DNA sequence: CCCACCAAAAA
RNA sequence: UUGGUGG
């Protein structure tokens, strides 16, 4: 993974809003440079004209010296894929959406855009005249990967196109399109509501509604009444959805743990881990620090949310180099960050640490056991989904493009 | 001061509930006596009254959409769309069968839409949020709701602490980008950024410094509160949002 | 396919 | 519900 100056995740931040923002690091800091002196003039045509303006100013402003309140944002590609990629340990789709790193024939690590790469793969096999526009193509893409069936059957029609189509993908990320073929196959149809918690206790509950459909009559007209009614349903097309938001959702959450912490607390847990700590003990500290260390052993996932239950008695149940080790992988200045789902803004000055945090959930993801962990709370059975590269993790760590 | 202030703030937003300021419209201050009339007409008179307030909204509005809003009135789908042709029939608001919609006649003063247009939805809190340690309250002095969004309400852990962190990032409004757009953005609708300063300057009245509250929906992805001021939503709401800690990038 | 949120129409 | 916003 490279690294970048303050003053240069400002370039990458005004190049992306123009805006480049499938172009590599340098590239995007190339085509900057070039153009700093005229970007005023700049903001008619860009892409994202008022945040490319307000990110133009702070440049201003910072070379000036002056403060700046200015967050740069960094996107997560394909942050669906990415989770799923990472659950499955598909090393295949990692390359499509920057989990592990792609080189070129020069060797250059490539910033990828899976949807453009599946659209040429689809019109290299197809030939001879394929009539498909790629953004039809990103939307059966994206649709089919949270479950939908009905929209790329709407882009690609029933017949030897669709079955191009789920080739190409069954090539492209053949873990990750088993493992939304999968989710299908899940649903209960007794459950009136599915329950799973993740890693960090968070619980999530999804109410099964069906629609029921009173019919009336309006000047011997028919018109058809429909509302949302809790029921249950024979298939349900919505676990891979759910289930992938819900671990984005948990991402955000514990990257902002990570990284806008509260460093009077991190240097307690510091010397708590140490036994240099005074002794305090709170009994409803318990409950919460086995629940969360016990999602630890089950997952590989670390939450720092432990450290609001961590005392002189509930650090006996835990592993103490874990939790010292968690903290050394933290920033060393804390930062506030502003989330958009997978999309992440920062000061500028703290773009590499929240690079490398991110890096570190999908890495964590990767390694572990996540996907078994909630899959059988949704089925209510134990089940375990094995990696189809158990090594993927270690190149994670690595990739330079995950948020770009 | 700013408790005094952040307390008006409060006051605005609750005299300005959508549908309850709506009522409020055709009940104690219509020149028209809608409880007699519904009387007259034999329609019960809290369903009349959402119909008109319905109306004064949607203007337009197809059949299924308006028994919509108003089934939990009476027994039956049936009975809904009756006691409409009823309300339509005695010129309530008209039905045109050539489009098959409801048209609104009677709609709300101007000088009323624009409070509304103003204060229906939250506004960031200019003190810090309250710590939430129960999932009811959302950050604001006045609230008890569910903190989760929509019919989702659990007692069970939905992880208050990610909203704490992110309830207390200060933030303020760039000026600088705010009117850039005005100014500059017809040339790179007008009555709606027109209540967006007015919102903004009352909002920052003593001091660019302020809050925004979060709640998660029932996956835990999490939402920041607010139309007129939030870093997400649209791409003209993001740019003028900063952080109220500026620092020296080196 | 899954969420969350706006906004309210023509002689 | 027609639409539009963000992901
Ligand atoms: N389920 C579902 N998720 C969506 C949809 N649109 C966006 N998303 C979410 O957004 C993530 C990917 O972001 P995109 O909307 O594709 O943004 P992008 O990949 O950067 O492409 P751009 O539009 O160019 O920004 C997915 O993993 C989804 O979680 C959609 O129509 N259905
Ligand atoms: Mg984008
Ligand atoms: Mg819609
Ligand atoms: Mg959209």
Redesign the pocket.
């Known amino acids: 993974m490279q690294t970048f100056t303050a003053r240069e995740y400002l370039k990458i931040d005004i190049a992306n809003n123009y805006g480049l923002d499938k172009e590599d690091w340098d590239d995007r800091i190339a085509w900057f440079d070039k153009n700093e002196n005229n970007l005023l003039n700049l903001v008619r045509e860009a892409e994202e004209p008022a945040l490319f303006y307000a990110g133009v100013k702070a440049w201003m402003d910072v070379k000036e010296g002056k403060p700046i309140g200015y967050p740069v944002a960094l ?1 997560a590609t394909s ?1 669906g894929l990415q989770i799923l990629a990472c659950l499955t340990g598909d090393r295949r789709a990692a390359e499509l959406c920057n989990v592990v790193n792609y080189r070129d024939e020069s060797g250059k690590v490539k910033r990828r855009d899976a949807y453009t790469v599946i659209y040429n793969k689809m019109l290299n096999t197809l030939g001879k005249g394929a009539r498909i526009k790629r953004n039809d193509c990103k939307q059966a893409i994206m ?1 089919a990967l ?6 790329p059957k709407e882009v690609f029609g029933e017949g030897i196109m669709l079955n191009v189509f789920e080739s190409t993908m069954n090539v492209e990320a053949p873990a990750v399109w088993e493992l939304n073929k999968f989710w299908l196959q899940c649903g209960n149809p007794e459950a009136f509501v599915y329950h799973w918690v993740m890693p960090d206790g968070f619980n999530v509950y ?1 109410k099964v509604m069906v629609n029921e459909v009173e019919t009336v009559h309006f000047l011997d007209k028919p018109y058809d009444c ?1 509302r949302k009614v809790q029921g249950t349903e024979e298939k ?3 676990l891979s ?2 289930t992938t ?1 819900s671990i984005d959702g948990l991402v955000v959450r514990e990257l902002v743990r990570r990284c806008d912490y509260d460093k009077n607390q991190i240097e307690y847990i510091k010397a708590l881990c140490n036994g240099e700590a005074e002794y305090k003990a709170s009994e409803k500290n318990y409950g919460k620090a086995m629940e969360l260390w016990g999602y630890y052993e089950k997952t590989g996932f670390l939450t720092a949310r432990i450290f609001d239950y961590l005392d002189s008695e509930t650090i006996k149940l835990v592993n103490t180099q874990d939790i010292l080790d968690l903290i050394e992988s933290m920033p060393k200045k804390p930062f506030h960050v502003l989330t ?4 992440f803004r920062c000061l500028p000055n703290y773009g590499n640490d929240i690079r490398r945090q991110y890096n570190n959930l999908l890495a964590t993801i990767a390694k572990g056991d996540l996907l078994s962990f909630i899959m059988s709370q949704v089925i209510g059975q134990e089940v375990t989904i094995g990696k189809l590269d158990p090594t993927l993790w270690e190149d994670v760590l690595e990739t330079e493009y995950a948020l770009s | 001061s700013t408790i005094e202030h952040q307390m008006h703030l409060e006051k605005l937003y609750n005299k300005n509930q959508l549908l309850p300021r709506m009522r409020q419209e055709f009940e104690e201050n219509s020149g028209i006596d809608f409880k007699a009339f519904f009387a007259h007409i034999g329609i019960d008179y809290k369903f009349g009254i959402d119909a008109m307030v319905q109306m004064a ?6 059949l ?2 308006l028994v ?1 809003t108003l089934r939990h009135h009476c027994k039956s789908a049936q009975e809904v769309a009756d006691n409409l042709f009823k309300m339509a029939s005695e010129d309530c608001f008209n039905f045109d069968p050539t489009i098959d919609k409801f ?2 006649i009677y ?1 709300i003063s101007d000088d009323v839409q624009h409070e509304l ?1 103003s204060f229906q ?1 939250p506004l960031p809190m200019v003190v810090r949020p309250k710590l939430l340690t129960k999932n009811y309250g959302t950050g604001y002095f006045t609230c008890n709701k569910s903190v989760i ?2 019919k ?1 309400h659990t007692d069970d852990d939905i992880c208050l602490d990610h909203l704490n962190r992110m309830n207390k990032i200060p933030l303020s409004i760039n000026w600088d980008v705010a009117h850039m757009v005005k100014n500059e953005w017809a040339n790179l609708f007008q009555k ?1 950024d027109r209540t967006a300063h007015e919102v903004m300057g009352l909002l920052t009245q003593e001091g660019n410094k302020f809050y925004l509250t979060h709640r998660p ?3 835990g ?1 999490t ?1 920041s509160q607010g ?1 007129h001021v939030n870093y ?4 003209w709401n993001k740019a003028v949002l900063e952080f109220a800690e500026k620092e020296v990038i080196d």
């Open positions: 996107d942050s649709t949270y479950g939908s069936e009905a929209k999804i429909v349900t097309r919505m959805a759910n938001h958009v789902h997978d999309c | 909204l949607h203007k337009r509005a197809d299924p959409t919509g048209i609104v709609t247009d939805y969004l929509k989702n709606y929906d029932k996956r992805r939402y139309y997400q939503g649209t791409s």
